[PDB]
Write a protein that binds this ligand. Structure first.
Ligand SMILES: O=P(O)(O)OC[C@H]1O[C@H](OP(=O)(O)OP(=O)(O)O)[C@H](O)[C@@H]1O
Ligand SMILES: O=P(O)(O)OC[C@H]1O[C@H](OP(=O)(O)OP(=O)(O)O)[C@H](O)[C@@H]1O
Ligand SMILES: Nc1cccc(F)c1C(=O)O
Ligand SMILES: Nc1cccc(F)c1C(=O)O
Ligand SMILES: Nc1cccc(F)c1C(=O)O
Ligand SMILES: Nc1cccc(F)c1C(=O)O
Ligand SMILES: [Mg+2]
Ligand SMILES: [Mg+2]
Ligand SMILES: [Mg+2]
Ligand SMILES: [Mg+2]
Lengths: 349, 348
């Protein structure tokens, strides 16, 4: 007999839910049957109890069942995502977006999930728009983009219309909850690999567990400086997901020859400013922004390799970094962005 | 800084006590209709799971009182008493507080009871009073008249706390008990200085006591060790005795006064008509477990009242309370007082 008092009562007692209860809650939420107060109570109670991977897996699985899918046979078997929770409160250039472009230019199909900024000045989606990339595409056109360009972008509001009740509650309460994990977990193209950033150190393990239950090849990452990206300012924590199991590691880019950068060297601005930062890096400019992009691109490439994993860790990273650097320095990344802008401009005719 | 929902909710979800004034800010937003239902719910739940402090709950109740309809000046005696609990004990008993309150008034102590309809039980104190023919819908002036002419008044919470309607609605939508469930007993709009106050939630009783301590009330905050938000007859109770700005926690055992141990099912209630029939039976002199529980709680309230003009010590105060409560039933005074109260309400 599932109900709000039962489920909320269990969470406020600090108990894990019974199997199916989180799914019931998410069903209510996604059908418009949960009142805002119920949505908010659930989000908060789940957060303070401390969600489990099974619970979050139920939320994401129900959410995905309401999402628009891409057409059959349009997503390569080895597609990767590069995306994080956001919410790190540091306001950097768009590292996941830049890395995605480089990764795609290295020959790895990228189907990227994303959204506008929530607290930062310019999110991935905003910066893409400033670059001339069409972010508003439906399933058929993202699929075509992936085939013709090597990359596609699923704009979350376009693909998850039924999440609008939850999204509004998220904005009303302001505080991060378990719902902040759902974007990265609900890419509607379901790529099987990814580099997934998590701003909340205490939730990164749960997100890893959800990918492990899917048998995805993923690195869930949290910079030890608070970034929802692999950082160059210090070490990072990586939850490596492979063969359905999770493995926690401390990662140090110094071991690959990266100098320690400062956070302000990665600082972003508005969409225009961040668009110019993308153009600078793809044009081959050296410096801390390139270093961070290359590092994160390599991470995604390593996750992709893990789909066919012989893959010793250190060699995988070495080849990842080399591939990312070549993708920029051959001009391929700059050319890929231009091809992507061109594709969007062809849609009119 | 400037207060905001993200700041306050963030602090609670980080498991931190709020800064002084933050709970009051939140409660004022809620009471003025400025908070969204999602914000109200997040706050209620986050405060509950953090574990609210006495200072925070005092801010909530104090803000809530500032928006209530007061009784007119000089109409509540200095030594008026309340008998009321959080409810939510999940046992669905007869209306023990309400019966006790009638008995207490009939013993000659002024009573101004705060109450409400049932939330999760079949018949709450207001429902039962209504079924008895007592008027539950009176405003400030007529409650004051009831108190002067009958020696008892009932403040119906929705009538005295209109601005609580947004919080009340959220409470009903989410169902789960929260810190808001403490607020009824803490916000009697007549502000009596004594009380027997039941708490269904063992972990929060102390918090409720802390709030009363900062008011210089004389209050017994009680939790039956079987879970009742009343002094129980089935086992011991925990009492947080509040007076002179301090709290004296103790374990209470009515077997020390010769009460036989009862079973919870012997105190079981029903619908409004059934619970009204139980009131009439007790007030008519019927002996048994229900009477015993009524007499115990009535004495408890009389003890709280004695703690105002505090001549008497704990034990003798209890012995006198039990005598007065028993006598109020056996001499017909309680039955007579209820008839008088019903009469008052019908004379407009
Ligand atoms: O405003 P915030 O809550 O801080 O979030 C900043 C951005 O990070 C996330 O995207 P993603 O990782 O795709 O973009 P990036 O290129 O900015 O890393 C999120 O969807 C936002 O676009
Ligand atoms: O439905 P529940 O949430 O369980 O609450 C039952 C009753 O308990 C409280 O009252 P009070 O102590 O005034 O009344 P009673 O003890 O006479 O029932 C509350 O105002 C309800 O009327
Ligand atoms: N912000 C959102 C993210 C994913 C899906 C959505 F419908 C929204 C939204 O409605 O704003
Ligand atoms: N942070 C996100 C990443 C991918 C998709 C999304 F909807 C979001 C989001 O939090 O809005
Ligand atoms: N249920 C209530 C309790 C106290 C004050 C109120 F306004 C209500 C209500 O609106 O239902
Ligand atoms: N439980 C209560 C006690 C006194 C006044 C009230 F409004 C309530 C209530 O919870 O509604
Ligand atoms: Mg990112
Ligand atoms: Mg980031
Ligand atoms: Mg009671
Ligand atoms: Mg009770």
């Amino acid at each position: 007999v599932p109900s709000w008092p039962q489920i909320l009562g269990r969470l406020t007692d600090n108990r894990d839910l019974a199997r199916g209860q989180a799914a019931w809650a998410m069903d209510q939420i996604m059908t418009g049957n949960a009142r805002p107060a119920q949505i908010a109570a659930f989000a908060v109670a789940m957060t303070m109890k401390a969600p489990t991977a099974d619970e979050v897996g139920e939320l994401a699985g129900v959410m995905l069942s309401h999402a628009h899918p891409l057409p059959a046979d349009t997503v390569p078997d080895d597609a990767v995502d590069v995306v994080g929770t956001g919410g790190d409160g540091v306001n950097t250039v768009n590292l996941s977006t830049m890395a995605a472009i480089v990764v795609a230019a290295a020959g790895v199909p990228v189907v990227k999930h994303g959204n506008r900024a929530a607290s930062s000045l310019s999110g991935g989606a905003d910066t893409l728009e400033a670059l001339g990339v069409r972010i508003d595409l439906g399933p058929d056109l993202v699929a075509r983009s992936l085939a013709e360009v090597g990359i596609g972008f699923c704009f979350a509001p376009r693909f998850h219309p039924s999440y609008r009740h939850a999204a509004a509650v998220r904005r009303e309460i302001g505080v991060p909850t378990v719902f902040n994990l759902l974007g990265p977990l609900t890419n509607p193209a379901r790529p099987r690999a990814g580099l997934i950033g998590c701003a909340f150190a205490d939730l990164a393990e749960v997100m890893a567990g959800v990918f492990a239950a899917r048998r995805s090849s993923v690195l869930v990452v949290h910079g030890d400086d608070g970034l929802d990206e692999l950082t160059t300012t210090t070490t990072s924590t990586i939850w490596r997901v492979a063969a359905g199991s999770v493995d926690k590691l401390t990662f140090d880019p110094a071991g690959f020859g990266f100098a320690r950068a400062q956070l302000d060297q990665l600082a972003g601005g508005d969409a225009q400013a961040n668009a110019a930062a993308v153009r600078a890096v793809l044009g081959g400019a050296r410096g801390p922004v390139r270093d961070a992009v290359v590092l994160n691109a390599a991470g995604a490439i390593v996750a992709h390799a893990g789909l066919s994993s012989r893959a010793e860790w250190l060699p995988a990273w070495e080849e990842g970094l080399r591939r990312a650097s070549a993708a920029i320095d051959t001009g391929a990344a700059e050319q890929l962005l231009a091809r992507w802008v061109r594709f969007g401009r062809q849609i009119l005719e």
